Every structure is written in structure tokens, then in C-alpha cells.
Design a protein around this nucleic acid. Structure first.
Lengths: 209, 55, 120, 122, 113
RNA sequence: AGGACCGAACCGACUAAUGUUGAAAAAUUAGCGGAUGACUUGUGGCUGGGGGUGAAAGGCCAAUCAAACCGGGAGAUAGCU
RNA sequence: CACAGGUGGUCAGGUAGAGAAUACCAAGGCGCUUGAGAGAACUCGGGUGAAGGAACUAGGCAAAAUGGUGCCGUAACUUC
RNA sequence: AAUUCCUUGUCGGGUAAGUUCCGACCUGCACGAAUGGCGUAAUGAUGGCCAGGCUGUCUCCACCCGAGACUCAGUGAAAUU
RNA sequence: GAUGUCGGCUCAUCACAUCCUGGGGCUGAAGUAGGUCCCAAGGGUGAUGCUGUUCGCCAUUUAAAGUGGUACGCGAGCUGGGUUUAGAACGUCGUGAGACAGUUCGGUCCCUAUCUGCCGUGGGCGCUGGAGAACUGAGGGGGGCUGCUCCUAGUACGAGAGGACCGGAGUGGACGCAUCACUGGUGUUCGGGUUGUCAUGCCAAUGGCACUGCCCGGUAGCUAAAUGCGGAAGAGAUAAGUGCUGAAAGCAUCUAAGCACGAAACUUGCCCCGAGAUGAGUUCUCCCUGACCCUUUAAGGGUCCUGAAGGAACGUUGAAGACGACGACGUUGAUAGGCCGGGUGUGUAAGCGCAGCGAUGCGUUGAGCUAACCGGUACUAAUGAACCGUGAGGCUUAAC
């Protein structure tokens, strides 16, 4: 089934009456406004394109403005697409709200993880550090060997090395839905989700269940 | 640690393909003195956005 | 990583930054306009403006704090006697930074920082 | 968190005074043992006329750690030292007959009912 | 952060007594031993207070049955039933971690008047 | 009193890292040993190459030692490259 | 080499300190002939660390630890 | 044994785990009495072992602080081919 | 006219003659267990005592502690204990100088990366008028392990001891990933104590320096030791193996026709990248429809007027980032600083009074201060320009 686009508000706890603390992530899910419906005949597949939030009228270009005007909806801060199953249908201009998840109890949350910059092999790939003492020469956190010898004669593609870490799209699967609060546009899921505070989150019903 | 063959002059100019400088091409004009200056910078005569600021 | 951290270290250790900014704040107070690198300004503000805020209200304790931050009695006197009264109704933002080119010796980006009044 | 070479105090009247963890058993490459975990130990010090001798190798259950345990609340209970109770190597039953110092709630597992009953507290 | 603020505000207790590090408090905690739900008392010295809104916590140190034990309580948890101050202590610090190395006469805290 | 003891100068040199086109053709930094003695240091002199001098290591003899350097024999010789 | 190396003697102020040790200063003399930014891996030289505690390694290498004075007390052995 | 190849001999001690150590036996391939034998107080920057203390040596690393590395302006090498 | 040796370390990749887990036939397979053979590489396959050691032997684990190849994989990655220089001694040998795959003690490991190879990060062009987005999926990668308990069930079995197949359920270990509610670490950028000394004329009150002088705490950020999640279910085609109907070869016979099954392999399914997928794709939207002249004439070139969508530059900046890039913002403004209010951390500031001979206490007073946190606020800085990018987009056929 489709999902909704929200933003990571932060993280807190919920105390249950039987003395259990549930670490929850607070996701603010405003109304998602359908801006385009893609169908098999015209686009080759079935999906809806949604928008959410708001954007400053000076920051929206007339290409984007014209695209929004065709749907007859207000400008949002972006556009996302959701693949449609066989059953459901939607109409352009329709708004979808958080009570979509009223009876779901597992979600998959996708976001852009925090960017770690250029990271070494110890941090990025959990490589073991070498000896801190006992004669070690300038080689406390270096990767060590990277290949065999003349017989391969090259470094194998996909070798684990230092480089960019984080700042990439990550999905976390099968999160408990703790609370759906329609009037506050809030969704509370158990556990941590990728991304820093204030970043966009894509919430979908769990695919594996 | 060191080359096995002398690189050609071709590879030299191919590396310097990215070393070219870029001109500013965007001088602003003060509304009072009419002087040219860098955008968001004091003019040589001490004006900024039409106001005498240094002297 | 540097997430949400604040404060340039300016290729200096802590005590040297503290001393340099104390001296520079004294200079700005006595002269009301000085010329430094653009990165040293934008850090002077975070030092000098709190002293003016402190000087808006005059008391023995506040003068002692100002003297602790800038160990110069002339600077404390001028602060509490002129700059506090001059900026009594100003809600922050007592300084201006004006980019003014590049330094001949090392091509460092220069800037002028001044108090917004300077008796104009 | 108890690992190999960790020294432990003895929380029963079996006779041992100091024991050292020989193996955190119950898995491959397993690193630590918390409260309620079973470990194999050697006896480094014992009283002259106890039921166990120095250098004996046998099992034990960890009942107090100064890393502590966490409750579902999020609270934590820490102790001032690490203590264990000696168990027979084959039948994992306590050797001693008195239990000294408080124990914690995690031992209620139908396997350590003797320790819970004999303990002074919790 | 207004919405998280309000979400936490809904959950806070309104009857938390005021106490300081160095006081002797007695805490009642709910204990479940099957189908029976009980109150257990834990009395000791408050050696640390983390007051962080809903996430506030405080540490209580007790010498029980020969050796020291300290519990970090989660204030606003429903597990904590009631907190009562039995004696006011007079100390200079906010975190009384030095008490861990001190016992008997050396661990006494003078009463605050 | 002491080829006493601790410990500065001073004289050495056990270990570690660093440096290795070095700041240096053997150093720097942190420790380390001795430190009234078989001690160290200044200024002169004296011993010369199959020779000196050596509490010994084939050590040292002007960043050169199973035989110093400079010039001659000498365009030594080389079934070898 | 305007080279972090070597180079005999003389003088020796104050406050702490047994001291020509050492901390801070006096007289004096300097800031070391490239600087300005960013605040990556990794390197170098430091600081701090939960539970553990040599399990590390060829090996406690390295780190950490002890330290001062008065006073009490001190083992085998001994060439006293 | 600074010697014993075999050999990690054997036995005892120390550890949970001991080709090391320490004490025995003699089964000295191949110790032996001034190219000294055997002990020995003290002493050694001597060699081998076991304790305690102590700790990031390690389990396993994590942060903070400087100096580089990155970038900019000035200057401007080398090995090598 | 030089291809560094062993072991450890860090990092590996592959083969299958598969150690574990999976499938199956035969048993001298009652069960529990096995044995032996066949198929099968998807994942996993100990850390310690001695020794320089690979090994070995131990003492305890484990689901299991596979075996080989890779210059006995790996020193322009590291170590250097061993072996293999120059000092010295011992046993032995030689008259001796010296020797000894006998022993012992001590004994300089340089390399600023051009090219390929790999991990990251960008430009230039193309993509056929340009632009803003959003897409698709053709291919690539990643993951892909297992214990224990309980129920079925003391049921089947045995004869009793003992004890299932088949089904499930819940919690672990190793491992990866996100994050920081909690709990901890760090926090030289926040407060407090305290030692020596030097200043602020002096007292008080402060500052400088002694490793942040030594310290006790601690905000944000980051972290792990903290906590959430996840390696599939299910398909499709199969391997070993098992069958159904069924002749050749009246019978038979899994195979020849024909019809079924069957494993952690395979292909998907879970996750990531991705049209330079030159084979450069797709949908929606935005913008430009003025002349003139010269000729080789051709998909030609200038000139004047015009410049649009958009983009860049510059500036305020960032839980983005070596640098680019990336994201928000420029007054139609909260993008940063300051400012206001709070929070938080430290713990009752200065000044004054009081008590005491004084040190000191006490009160005003939980007071004062408070980095990066939250919620605000135009006070300061985000300036009109300008710059780039155009003037309706080739040809041919076929449809309409």
C-alpha cells in the first residue's frame, strides 16, 4: 500500500501504565496532496505523485508552479512517488492524512542518514586497529594489506577502503506503530529512524511483516 | 614512489586542463560615487551602497 | 565531524585565542573602528557585543566582570560611561562588518568592523 | 560485564573467597556475562576448612555486577563489586547453604529458586 | 520542539517533592512477583540528580546487607510510586560521587537546618 | 673516612618513539648511569704508517683503517665485462 | 647553509625552595624571515575514559603507578 | 649445566591451562680443579622466571586539544625516466 | 648491473577433496544416536598456558573449531622473536689461525606514488531548441549463520532404561545497520574548589603562568559499553534421491513418448546504486513565433534590435562537507551573529551587614553566572546591477 511523507521531529519516550518506557520517534505527517496520478496506459505503471508542507512563493519556479497549478494544489517542499497496488485508486488533488496508518502496527521508515564525511576504514568498515605499541611504525589505524601478490596482480573490485560515509538513503524495517494522532498530525514509531532532526522521512507499511 | 617512464607533454596539458583561472566578470557600480567595486565590498574611495563609510 | 559546534579555533590554542580576542576587543572599544581579517571579525562580535550588553546596566559587580573579561580600566570606564548609554535602546547588533578587499602580504580577506554609531 | 580473567567475590558460604572467570560459556566468541549468566571459574582463595579447595574448576552464576542491570523502566541498579555463587559442575545447583548480600530480580528463573529463597533481599 | 514539549508535558507527574543531593529519601517502587503487585522501599542518600524534564532521574546510594548498592531512578516513571524526604543533608556539591570511597564515620553527612 | 650515598653543573650513553632527499653524512624528545674520582676540562708539547697508541674493539690515528693521506713507478696487470 | 649540533672562563637579583634542582618574576633580552583560512581520513605529540585488568606481545615494550619530610617499625642471609 | 644431541628425559613444585622457571635423579652425545673448580655477603642501564600494585598493552576502542595533511596567496626541489 | 627469509599482525580472495547447518539412498538403521556413500559453497567455522615458532600438547568453550591454492597470499601495509654479519662465552674439533643448520647473551627494517589496480569525490562534452523537477529499470552490489528452552509428547519406540519424526512458539550468541529517549564516556567552548608565584597603587575582588598547573562536576555535538531493527516467509526452475502411467524387450521397467516431486545451491522475493542503458528512455510543467545584408551557396556567415524559461556569480549560512559538490536563505527575509525569555550546568557571586579575638561561619541568596540547546525578535550582515543562457528547433518516409 502507499505511504506518506513526514519529517523527523525528534525522539522521546512513552511510559506505559505497567512501568515500561518505549523509546519512540515523533514523525510529523501533515496532509499529503496528490499532484499527479500515473497509470499504465500513459506512464506504463501505476503510481501517485504526492506533495507536502509548503514552499515560499519566491522559491517556486514557473515550471514547478505550473505543475502544481495543473493539480490545483498548493506548492509543497518536494515531490515523492508511491507505487500503487492493484486495489487502491486515488484522484489528483486528493489529500491523504495520517489516519491512513490507523490499523497498520508495522511501518518501514526511509530517510537520509547523517553524513559522517570522509571516514577511515576503522570507523567505516569496523576494521581492527593494529598494535598501539610493540614497535609499530606509523601504522596504528591504516588498513594493512589490500591484495595478495603477482598472481592476482591487482586490487579486487569492491575492496573495503576509506571514503564517504553516511549521507545516503537508508531504510529501517518493521517498526512498531505506537500511536497515531490524527488531530496533531503525529505518528509515533518504536525505535530510531535514519536522519537528523528536521529531515524528510518516508513511511510505508511494512513489506515483510 | 617514482615514475618508470617519462610522462609526455600531452599528459601535462591534460592535467592543466583544470588549472585555468576564472574572471570575476561581475563588477558592481556604486550608486553615489559611480565607482566600480567588488559586490559586497567597500569601494576604493571608501563608499558602500552609496554611503561614505571610511574616509 | 563538526556537527553543531561553534567557534573558530583560528590555528591557535585556547589561551592564545582568549588573549587575542581580549586585546582586539580593547582595540575596538578604544578606537571604534579596526581592520582585521574577515574570519577574526564575526568572532569579535561574539566577544565585544556581550560586553556592551553587560555595560547597559551599571553596578560594581558588572564593572568587576567587565574588568575580568578585559583587564583594562580605561576600556571598562569607556564602556560603562559612553557605550552603555549610547546603546541603551539598541537590542543587540552594535557592530558592522564591511569587506574591504585582500591583504597585500598574504592575500587574506580583510574587513572593517565598527560600532554602528561612531558619533554620526 | 564479566569476562575472562575477571576476579569475583563469592556470595555464599561455600568456602571460596576469590574466583576468576575462566570462560564466559553459552555461545561462540561470546564476550561478557551479566547477572544471571553462567560462567566457568577457578578458585584463587578459599578458607581453610570449606567445601571447596584452591585451584578447583567449576561453574558459577553471576549475581552482582558493578556495571549493573537495567529494568524495562529504563532504571539501572549498580553494585559496588562483582559477586557470584558457586554451582556444582554437573548439576548446576548451589554448593553453599547461605547467601550473602542482596541479589537482583533477574534470578527468578525456576533454575535459581534456591538463591532467591536463601537471599537476604530482592 | 513545541510538539515534543507538549507530548512530554502530558506525561509528567505533578506531585514530585523537592529534594537536593545529600538528602535521605525513601522511594516506593512497584514490585511484581507473579500475580501480586507490591511496594518495596528503597532508602538512601541522593548522590546525583539529573533534572531534564520528563527524562529527569536521580541516583540513590544505600549500604545494604554489607555492600553498597545504588539505583538510578527514572522520575516520572509509574514504577516509582512515591518519594519522601526523610532527612535534609548539607553538602556543597551537586554530585556526591566522592561518597563511593567513604564508609562508616567518614561517610556521614551533616543535617541541613 | 670512603675508586661511600642521593642529586644540579659537568661527563657519559641503557631504552622507547620520531626523524630516514633529516633541523643533523648518528641528532631531537622523554626517561637513564655516574657525579671527590681508575673524575672531568683548558693550553702547549710528544709518539707516524707494517708504524704509533690501545683497561682489547682488528678500536682509533682529521666524517678514511686486516694497514692513513698525497705524489711518482704507472697507460701495473685483468684468458674478464 | 642566517644549519634544532658543538664551543674554555667570569657574574649571579627577588619570592617560594636544602639547593647553581624547580615554579613565577627583576635587570635586561626576545616572539624563533612565509603567512591566511577550513577544521576530512591518516600521521605526530598530549589530555580523559564505562565494565574489565596483561586476557596484549617474542617479551608489561610502551603507558600507568610510586615519590617529600619528621616519626614508629622492619625479614632471610651476611664478608657484620 | 652460557655444556645433556636426543629432549619438550623423568619426577616434584608453581597455573585452570607450564618446550620457561625452580628443586631433584644421573641416564656428563660432549663438566672438572689457576686456557682454574666449587660456593658466596654486596653489587650490576646484566641474563631467565613468579607475585602484588598499576594501567587503553589488550577485550575494543570513543571523544577532546594542538602540529601537519586539505584549500588560498608568495616562493619553489628531489629520486627517476 | 639484487625476484628480502620464517612466524605473528592487519587485510584477504578463491577452489571443493563440505567441518557445521540443508536435501537423500543403504545399514549389522527400534528410539536416542550413529556409520557409510551421494548432492550441495548460501552463510558461519574459538580465545587462551608453553614454545620464536607453523605445528604440537594442554585447560576450557562451541552448532562447528574444514582442507588446500593464492611468490609455503600479504615487510613501496606493520613487526622482527627466530634464521643469517661484525662483540663475547660454553660444549666439541683442530698444533694453531679459526670452525660448528650444536648452544648462549647482546645486536641501524629507507621509500614525498608517475602509471595500472581499487575506495571516495568532482568537472567537460554528448544526449539534437533550451529549462525546472519527478521518474523508470536494463544491468551492478549487499544480506543470506546458528544455539537453547518449551509445546506437540513421555505420545511413537523399547522391554526397560532412555526417548522421536513431523509441526510450531519464545529468547539468546556472534554479525551488520540506523540512532542517541534512556544509561554511560569525552567534553582545553560552562561553572566551582585549590597550590606556588607575579601583577592590577593598595585592601578586598580579579587576571596571567606553572601539562586544561592540579582538580571536582558538566551543555550541545560525537560516541558505545546504551538502545531500536534486520537477514526472511513465499514462489519458479532444479541436484542427489523418489515416484506415476508405460513399450522396446506378452512379462517387467522412474524413461524411451508422456506426467509428477524434491535442498541454506540457482533465479527472484528484502535492501542499495543506477539511461555515458552512446542501446543516452518516460511523463507533467515553464519559456522564445523581429528585421536586414552578403555570398562559396549550406545543417552558411555576419549586422542591428533583442536575452526569455532558467542557470550561475556574489553574499548570510548549514546535525552537508578535504575541495568541489549538496541543502536553506537575500529584505516579498528568521539564513547566521547579537538580543530577549526560558532551559541547563555549576552550586548560595560581588558588595554590604551580622557573629566570633581571629581564621571562619551566617544572611541577602539556591544566589550569581552560564559553549554548541529550545522558543522568539530585523538590531547587524545577506544591495539595484551586471554576467551567462535567446528569438520557435534538421532531414526523409509513413500515417493523420
Amino acid at each position: 500500500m502507499i505511504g506518506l511523507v513526514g519529517k523527523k521531529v525528534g525522539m522521546t519516550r512513552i511510559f506505559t501504565e505497567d512501568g515500561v518506557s518505549i523509546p519512540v520517534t515523533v514523525i510529523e505527517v501533515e496532509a499529503n496532496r496528490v499532484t499527479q496520478v500515473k497509470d499504465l496506459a500513459n506512464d506504463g505503471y501505476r503510481a501517485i505523485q504526492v506533495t507536502t508542507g509548503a514552499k515560499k512563493a519566491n522559491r517556486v519556479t514557473k515550471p514547478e508552479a505550473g505543475h502544481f497549478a495543473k493539480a490545483g494544489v498548493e506548492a509543497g517542499r518536494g515531490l515523492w512517488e508511491f507505487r500503487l497496488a492493484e486495489g487502491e485508486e486515488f484522484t489528483v488533488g486528493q489529500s491523504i492524512s495520517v489516519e491512513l496508518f490507523a490499523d497498520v502496527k508495522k511501518v518501514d521508515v526511509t530517510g537520509t542518514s547523517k553524513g559522517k564525511g570522509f571516514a577511515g576504514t576503522v570507523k567505516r568498515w569496523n576494521f581492527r586497529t593494529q598494535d598501539a605499541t610493540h614497535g609499530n611504525s606509523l601504522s596504528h589505524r591504516v588498513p594493512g594489506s589490500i591484495g595478495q601478490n603477482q598472481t592476482p596482480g591487482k586490487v579486487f573490485k569492491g575492496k573495503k577502503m576509506a571514503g564517504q560515509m553516511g549521507n545516503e538513503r537508508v531504510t529501517v524495517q518493521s517498526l512498531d506503530v505506537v500511536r497515531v494522532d490524527a488531530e496533531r498530525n503525529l505518528l509515533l514509531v518504536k525505535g530510531a529512524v535514519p536522519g537528523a532532526t528536521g529531515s524528510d522521512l518516508i513511511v510505508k507499511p511494512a513489506v515483510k511483516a | 614512489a617514482v615514475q618508470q617512464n617519462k610522462p609526455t607533454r600531452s599528459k601535462r596539458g591534460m592535467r592543466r586542463s583544470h588549472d585555468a583561472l576564472t574572471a570575476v566578470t561581475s563588477l558592481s557600480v556604486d550608486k553615489t560615487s559611480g565607482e566600480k567595486h567588488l559586490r559586497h565590498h567597500i569601494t576604493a574611495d571608501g563608499y558602500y551602497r552609496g554611503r561614505k563609510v571610511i574616509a | 565531524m563538526r556537527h553543531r559546534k561553534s567557534g573558530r579555533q583560528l590555528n591557535r590554542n585556547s589561551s592564545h585565542r582568549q588573549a587575542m580576542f581580549r586585546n582586539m576587543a580593547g582595540s575596538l572599544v578604544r578606537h571604534e573602528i579596526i581592520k582585521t581579517t574577515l574570519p577574526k571579525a564575526k568572532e569579535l562580535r561574539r566577544v565585544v557585543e556581550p560586553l556592551i550588553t553587560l555595560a547597559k546596566t551599571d553596578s560594581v559587580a558588572n564593572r568587576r566582570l567587565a574588568f575580568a573579561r578585559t583587564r583594562d580600566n580605561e576600556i571598562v570606564a569607556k564602556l560603562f560611561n559612553e557605550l552603555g548609554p549610547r546603546f541603551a535602546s539598541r537590542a543587540g547588533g552594535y557592530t558592522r562588518i564591511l569587506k574591504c578587499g585582500f591583504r597585500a602580504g598574504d592575500n587574506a580577506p580583510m574587513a572593517y568592523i565598527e560600532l554602528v554609531d561612531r558619533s554620526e | 560485564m564479566i569476562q575472562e580473567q575477571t576476579m569475583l567475590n563469592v556470595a555464599d558460604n561455600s568456602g571460596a573467597r576469590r574466583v576468576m572467570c575462566i570462560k564466559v560459556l553459552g555461545g561462540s566468541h561470546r564476550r561478557y556475562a551479566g547477572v544471571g549468566d553462567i560462567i566457568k571459574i577457578t578458585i584463587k582463595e578459599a578458607i581453610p576448612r570449606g567445601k571447596v579447595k584452591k585451584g578447583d574448576v567449576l561453574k558459577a552464576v553471576v549475581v552482582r555486577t558493578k556495571k549493573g542491570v537495567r529494568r524495562p523502566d529504563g532504571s539501572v541498579i549498580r553494585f559496588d563489586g562483582n559477586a557470584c555463587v558457586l554451582l556444582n559442575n554437573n548439576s548446576e545447583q548451589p554448593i553453599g547453604t547461605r547467601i550473602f548480600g542482596p541479589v537482583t530480580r533477574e534470578l527468578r528463573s525456576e533454575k535459581f529458586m534456591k538463591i532467591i529463597s536463601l537471599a537476604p533481599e530482592v | 520542539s513545541n510538539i515534543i514539549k507538549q507530548l512530554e508535558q502530558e506525561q509528567m507527574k505533578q506531585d514530585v517533592p523537592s529534594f537536593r543531593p545529600g538528602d535521605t529519601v525513601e522511594v516506593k517502587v512497584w514490585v511484581v512477583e507473579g500475580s501480586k503487585k507490591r511496594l518495596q522501599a528503597f532508602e538512601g542518600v541522593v548522590i546525583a540528580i539529573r533534572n531534564r524534564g520528563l527524562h529527569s532521574a536521580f541516583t540513590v546510594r544505600k549500604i545494604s546487607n554489607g555492600e553498597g548498592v545504588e539505583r538510578v531512578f527514572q522520575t516520572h516513571s509509574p514504577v516509582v510510586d512515591s518519594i519522601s524526604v526523610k532527612r535534609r543533608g548539607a553538602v556543597r556539591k551537586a554530585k556526591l560521587y566522592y561518597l563511593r570511597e567513604r564508609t562508616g564515620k567518614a561517610a556521614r553527612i551533616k543535617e541541613r537546618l
